[PDB]
Each structure stands twice: as C-alpha cells, then as structure tokens.
Symmetry: C3
C-alpha cells in the first residue's frame, strides 16, 4: 500500500480537533529517552491505535504513544518509541508521523538514537551531534520518498546536503557548556544500516573507510522526510558500545551491554533535552 | 513479473502496427527529449496504447515510443523513461529493452543527467560511460532477479564488457570530426536509487568507490540489454558538481538539471544524430 | 511469514519420519552436491514432501534434504540451497536453518562457489571463510528482519565471532597433515545479490572494501545459524578470478565456473568428510 495526501490530512485534522496543544517541536525519542514524556506538563496522550491511519506498534511493550504537552514551557509532540526497518516496517510507515507533524504546524524535529562508535575517540556514554549521514539503505532503493511525490509536501528531488541545522547544533553545545559537564559533546557522521545483527569486523572496517563516526538502525528516513517537508532537524546519538574493529579483541557488541548503556545515560539525556528546549528558536515572525 | 508471451505479444503488436524495423533503440535522458524532432517518417505510440507497456500514474508526464530515421538510421526512441524512484519495479523499468530485442534492435543508446564527482568535470560536460557501479544491484535491486529465461540470455551474464569499446572510440573521433573543442569526458557512472540528492558524506563515499558521475537511471536498462546480447553505448550530461564540502551554499536542485538540459539540447541531439553513421550495420 | 509453531511442526514431522538425529547441518554449494553420496544409511526427503518447506521452482533444481552419517557423524545435508537472485525472500532461503536448530543440530557447515578478488588466489583454491561483508544486509536484505523470537535468538545478535575459531585451527591442522599441493586460503567473503557478474569498477570497489572472494549466497544462512547459537564454518571454492582491470580478454562465464566446480570440488568434499571427525561432540 501507501498513503494519500487526504490520509495525512485526516490524521492531522483529527489530532488538531482532539487536542488543544499546538506543537512547534516534534521529539522522536530513541534509546534512553523513553521516559522523557514524564517531564511534560499538561500532557495529553494518544495511543497510535486511537489515531486514524497511524501504524500500530506490533512489537513487545506498551501501545506506541503520541504525547502532547509543554517541555520547559515549549509546545512539544513526543513519539515515545519509533518504528525500525529491522522490525519489518516499510519506510512509508516509519516516516508517516513526520508528515503528520508537518501538517500540525511543527517547524522543528528533534530525533535521537543509540549508535555504535566507529570513531576510536568515542567512549560509551558519549553524545554525538549528527552533523551528516550516509543513507546506505537509500542507495539501494530504501528511501522513504520512493513513489509518487506530492508537491504539497515538497520537491520531487530534495537536497540533503544541509539537513542538520547549524543553529540547533550551536545551541546543543551552549546548553552542554552551561551544564559544565566533564566530557565534550562529540560531532560526526551517522551511517544507517538496516540491522538488526551487529557488524562483523570486516563490516566495521567498511563503515570506517566510508568516513562514518557512528552506526545505527534508524533516524535517516525520518530526517529525509522532515527535510522534504522543510522542517529544521536536530539529531544526536548515544554511543552505547565501541564497534569491534580487529580480530584480536576479546570484546563483542551485545544487547545486554547496550541496554545497560541506555539505562545509565537515560536521566542525563532527559536533563540535556529538557534544558535544550529553552534554547530552541521561536517560530518565524 | 511479465511472462515471455507478454513480451512476444507487445513486440508482435508493434511490428504489425508500424512498418518500421528499428536497428537502434535510443532511451532519451534529460537534455535529449527533443531528439525525436530530428526523426523523419516518424510513427508514434503512446505507452498507454501499447499492450503490457507501463505508463505514468502521474498525469504530469505521459510517454511516447517514436519509430523513425535518425540521419538515415532506423531507430526507436523512448520519450519518457521509467525510474526506480517513481516506484516502478526494475522488471517494469527494463520492460521496453526486452521488447526492443524482440523487435530486432541490436544496439541500445542510453543517455542520462548525472552529478559530477570527478573534480576534472565542469557543468555542461558530456561523459561517455566506460563502466558503472550498480549500488542497488549489490542489495538485490537487479532487473534479472527472478526466474531466468534462456530465450533472452544466461542465468549469470558478464557485465565487465557492457559499454562497447568500438562505439566509444567512434564517439571520441566523431566529437573531434564535428570540430568540438571542449573535450569528451569518459568514466564510471554510479547508480543510486534517489530521489533525494546526496549529502557531503555520501558524495565522499561515491568518490572513494571510484565513481566519476552519479545518477538515478540507466544501469538496469544496460544490464537487461547485455543479457539480451545488445551492443550498448551511453553518456551522461554533467548537470551539476556534487557538493563535496560544508561551506558552499550550492544545493543540487531539479532547476539546475532542467536548465543544463535545455542549454546542452542542440549539441547532444547533433552528436547523437551524427553518431548514427558510426553504428555497425546488422 | 511463519511463527515458532510452524518451525516446530516441520521439525516434529521430520523427527517422526526418520530415526536419524543430526548434530551437523551441511549446506552444499554449487558443484559440491556429490557430498550426499559419501553419507552411510542415507535417507532422502524432497522439499516438496516436507510441511511448510519452501519448494525450489526451477524444472531441474534438486530440492532434497539428506540425513545420514558422514565419516561417522550424524548430519543433515541440503543438496540445493535457495538464492535471493532466483527471487526467494531471505525468510525462505533460511527456514531450513531454523528447522535444523529445532532438530537439535549444533553445527552448520556452509560451502559455496566464489569469484576470487584476492589476486593471490588461483582457480580451484579453497578459502576458509574468516569473515563476511553483508552488502544486502546494509540495505535491509537481512534474514532477521521482522518479529524476533528468543526460542531462536536475541533481537540484536553479534556476528563479529560468526566463523568458529576452533574449526579454523583444525581445518588448518587437517589440511597440513594431508600434504596438499596448494595451501588452504583464508579471507573475507562479500555477498552480492547477483545474478549478473561484476563490472571492473564493481570488482575494484569490493577489493577496496577488503573482500577476498565474492558470491551470491551463504551470509544469510550464517546470520540465522549464529542467531540460533550454532557453531559455523565454511569454505569458498574459487571458480574464477574476477576481472579487476580494463587490459584483459578474459570474461567470467557460467560454463568456466561449472567446469571448475567439477574439478577440485571433490577435493573440498573429501576435506569436509575428514573434518567431520574434528567437530566437537555435543555435551
Ligand atoms: O554497533 C552497532 N551497530 C549497529 N547498530 C547499532 C546500534 S542501534 C541499536 C542497537 C541496540 C538497541 O537496543 C537498545 C535498546 F533496545 C534499548 F532499550 C536501549 F535503551 C538501548 F540503549 C539499546 F541500545 C537499540 C538500538 C537503536 C534503536 P534507536 O535508538 O535507533 O531507535 C547500537 N549499536 C550498534
Ligand atoms: O547530483 C546528482 N545526484 C544524483 N542524481 C543526479 C541526477 S539524475 C536526475 C536528477 C534530477 C532530474 O530532474 C528532472 C527530471 F526528473 C525530469 F523529468 C526533467 F524533465 C528535468 F528537466 C529534470 F531536471 C533528472 C535526473 C535524470 C534523469 P535521467 O536522465 O537519468 O533519465 C542529476 N544530478 C544528480
Ligand atoms: O565472480 C563471481 N562473482 C559473483 N558471484 C560469483 C559466483 S557465485 C556462482 C556463480 C555461478 C554459478 O553457477 C554454477 C552453477 F549453476 C552450477 F550448477 C555449478 F555447478 C557451478 F559450479 C556454478 F558456478 C554458481 C554460483 C554459486 C552458487 P552457490 O555455491 O553459492 O550456491 C562465482 N563466481 C562469482
Ligand atoms: Na569493425
Ligand atoms: Na557500499
């Protein structure tokens, strides 16, 4: 299947008529930010299943949630969880919410994730501001824009060379500076791979040689649709593990360690984003 | 997928609806739409009247098959080509090449627009396609995926000799004989699916791989053509230099591509028309 | 699109139709189908007659599971693997591996035909697979894609240790104490979808990525086996040297790869039989 413009329209107008909230900022909560909805005021919760056209979470855990409220005084719409390719979702389902956000009047997307460090400078618990991406699925046909283009969203052939807003990154660094934290923020290129299996050593070397600083399984498709629509985009990676890059290492990527990294970073990440909210540019006069 | 009878039905319909017996198929990429103007004794078919032929489901652009003589060479020209980014399966993109084979065509000329990755290239350059990197193909988006039909070709066709050496030497010589000074480029075309343009990081990847130009077409048609045994010649119009640093304000856009096309139209149409005399006879 | 109950039904059907209890699964690559003849007490099942099993769709394609003993070790052989280029989805290509797991198999041996990228390789060489590059996997053609079930494995299994170090050692040891002419090669297998062979520029890309051999199979079976916790090892027979530069009259062709996988193929088959004795017993 796909979605028509009318489908997005009906979802948007249904949400506009069922909440008083008028979000400026969309937060898609990746690994470690599950709990960020807890810091919202005047929170209003919709299960994906209540929302017309909205893909249902078919994965273990709670019904996926769209939550409207104020984060540090700023009108937010928050996706508690996101869809992954590795779960069997087509990219036109993964990115469905980004079109709806656009039609609600959102002008800014915050997108976070977990990723493996490819840059040897990176340490577990580091935060990497996404400055650029390598869409490996994109190269082969797995681009969320594949299909007919609606001129109501954007151009047939949108540019991605300016996708990661300079100002948002400037203000992430300021916020971080004023937290007087010990470690610098990192900044680099995120490469998307479909996953869900972790890289071989030979694969890690490929991604290093390609110039990737971190690797994960999400985010790029949401960024491409956001940019098609004209939203400004801010992203970062929690570095949950250092990808294994030689045959002599005794270490090995694993689910238990990357869960532990998320759980440990979780409150630091909520603190970071809660404060950053205060510094997000206002809608344009 | 199509059955073998589906291809035979379409080829039979065309052969009984036109008297034309094309030797050469020309797939007009951006910059070359107007090449049909140079045909004589033209005979026209909307894709929509041609049995089994894929159309656009966008009323924006329909498509035409045009039979005619180009500089006295019997030709069939696709005006409007199918792209993976539009949501066509590759077995639809490449459907026409199968039909051309069954019409008796023995040479495919394929042209496109491409972003320049080789820093030697300028906007408005023509690059002869010497070789390709098929990134979608590596992942399973190869037009031969599925059952193989020996009436077309082998299970496992070689692509190491896809781009006819003789036609490229004759294209270079023709470009000089025409008294053109700004030289013909030659190099490696990488297909990416698009339709969004590359990030800086992606551009750097495509350069590290050894690609000289990047586009969103052509490689599937070339693979199916070589599977069928067609001789293949092609080139890219360098419509833009791909952004390779973070400071430049240039953003790749459709308007640059359109505008580079119109500017190069007269020159490319002349080049292809005159090249027809270099194509070996059947 | 099966659930755990489907794989279980298939395994129980096999358990109740043969007394054979395999420890080792062998997937026989192109030109290596002779290995089923080295089985003792052989028992054949056509894929057609196995519940839920994907049917192979080419007129003359051997779709048979063969249970037996190879050099005195209980095993099950696939004669004819499924290939993504034939049009099979990876969940079909790898359904037998999940069934082997439920049958109690703890080891998978994978064999294939590969094009040589390493200029040191010669046609007929055997390359012990040390590592792989899953190019289809990067893009979404990963056989774990979709719902995960822990009766198979983890949502995010590691692949950096896929190729069993113990069986590496013993393959190198066994090969030496056979006094063979050429050495056993080792290196990285890159999977491409095919079915068309590589351009020179594609060749050069795969070499730049650090691949030693290229083919169109194997990696997805390895991923599903490691997901399930099976020990894995495997071999490429080098059927052809990939054309890596424009000064050359050679062309990789179906006929020259067919002929090469009738030559030192029987060498790899004897080597696989011998190495059965080096596979550890189950606890
Ligand atoms: O080396 C690597 N290679 C390739 N990819 C990767 C990834 S992506 C990933 C890997 C594991 C995972 O599990 C959890 C998890 F389930 C939690 F609940 C959690 F808190 C947590 F930190 C995790 F890491 C989530 C995600 C990424 C989801 P998303 O954030 O992109 O939506 C991490 N490291 C590597
Ligand atoms: O930097 C680059 N990166 C990756 N790819 C490219 C391409 S390929 C391309 C990009 C845009 C485009 O826009 C149209 C278009 F779609 C029309 F239909 C049209 F009439 C028209 F004028 C255009 F400008 C056409 C084509 C090329 C089609 P083709 O020649 O392969 O058939 C050019 N530059 C880059
Ligand atoms: O240069 C290369 N590039 C990319 N890929 C490759 C391959 S993989 C391959 C290529 C051709 C082929 O055909 C047969 C065949 F059909 C038989 F019946 C046969 F006996 C036989 F020896 C062949 F070579 C089989 C396979 C491999 C299947 P598998 O071993 O993985 O299952 C080999 N060389 C290259
Ligand atoms: Na000649
Ligand atoms: Na690649």
């Amino acid at each position: 299947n796909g979605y028509t413009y009318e489908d997005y329209k009906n979802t948007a107008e249904w949400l506009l008529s069922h909440t008083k909230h008028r979000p400026q900022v969309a937060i898609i909560c990746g690994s470690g930010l599950g709990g960020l909805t807890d810091k919202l005021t005047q929170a209003q919760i919709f299960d994906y299943g209540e929302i017309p056209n909205f893909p249902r979470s078919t994965v273990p855990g709670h019904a996926g949630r769209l939550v409207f409220g104020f984060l540090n005084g700023r009108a937010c719409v928050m996706m508690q969880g996101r869809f992954h390719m590795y779960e069997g979702y087509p990219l036109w389902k993964v990115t469905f919410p980004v079109r709806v956000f656009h039609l609600l009047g959102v002008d800014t997307l915050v997108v976070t994730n977990a990723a493996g460090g490819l840059n040897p400078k990176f340490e577990v618990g580091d935060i990497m501001l996404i400055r650029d991406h390598i869409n490996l699925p994109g190269f082969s046909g797995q681009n969320p824009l594949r299909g007919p283009n609606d001129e109501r969203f954007g151009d047939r052939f949108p540019a991605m060379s300016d996708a990661y807003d300079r100002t948002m990154r400037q203000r992430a660094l300021s916020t971080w500076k004023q937290m007087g934290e010990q470690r610098e923020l990192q900044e680099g290129t995120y490469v998307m791979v479909a996953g869900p299996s972790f890289e071989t050593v030979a694969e890690c070397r490929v991604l290093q040689k390609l110039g990737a600083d971190a690797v994960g399984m999400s985010t790029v498709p949401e960024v491409i649709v956001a940019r098609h629509c004209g939203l400004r985009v801010f992203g970062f990676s929690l570095i949950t593990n250092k990808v294994i890059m030689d045959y002599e290492s005794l270490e090995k990527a694993n689910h238990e360690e990357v869960l532990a990294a998320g759980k440990q970073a979780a409150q630091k990440l909520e603190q970071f984003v809660s404060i950053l909210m205060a510094s997000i540019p206002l809608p344009d006069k």
